[PDB]
Amino acid sequence: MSAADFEAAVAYVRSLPKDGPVQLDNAAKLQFYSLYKQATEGDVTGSQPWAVQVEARAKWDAWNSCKGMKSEDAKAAYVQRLIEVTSQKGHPWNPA
Numbered sequence: 001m002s003a004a005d006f007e008a009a010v011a012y013v014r015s016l017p018k019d020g021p022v023q024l025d026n027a028a029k030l031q032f033y034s035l036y037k038q039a040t041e042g043d044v045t046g047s048q049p050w051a052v053q054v055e056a057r058a059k060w061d062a063w064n065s066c067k068g069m070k071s072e073d074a075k076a077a078y079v080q081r082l083i084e085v086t087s088q089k090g091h092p093w094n095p096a
């Protein structure tokens with residue numbers, strides 16, 4: 001995918017209204033969070049947090065799951081995941 005396709009995917013996620021036809025579940029939120037961090041900040045920072053800290057632990061595990069990818073590898077995955085999660089919910093989003 002093109003770079004502007006990723007920047008538009010990030011904008012579409014950030015422009016999603018509260019009440020709308022597209023609502024991201026928590027699993028999809030973790031997926032987009034992991035791919036975004038992998039394509040913008042590189043590999044995961046820090047060690048595996050306390051499991052009691054459920055959110056921080058969940059975010060670190062998702063980010064560590066993508067460890068070893070280049071930024072361009074994760075940007076296409078971010079676009080593809082957005083195209084898929086928009087199709088199964090009745091409103092397909094596609095770039096360009």
Ligand SMILES: CC(C)(COP(=O)(O)OP(=O)(O)OC[C@@H]1O[C@H](n2cnc3c(N)ncnc32)[C@@H](O)[C@@H]1OP(=O)(O)O)[C@@H](O)C(=O)NCCC(=O)NCCS
Nearest residue numbers: 009010011013014026029030032033034035036037055059
């Ligand atoms: C830190 C926080 C309070 C504010 O995030 P923000 O307004 O995007 O700005 P920040 O620069 O502080 O954080 C951006 C980082 O990239 C992520 N991000 C930004 N834009 C994104 C996008 N388009 N797609 C995916 N992840 C994105 C943020 O989730 C993340 O926070 P982190 O640094 O703590 O991991 C928010 O990330 C948070 O921790 N809580 C809200 C999210 C939440 O409750 N759960 C998310 C995982 S289930």
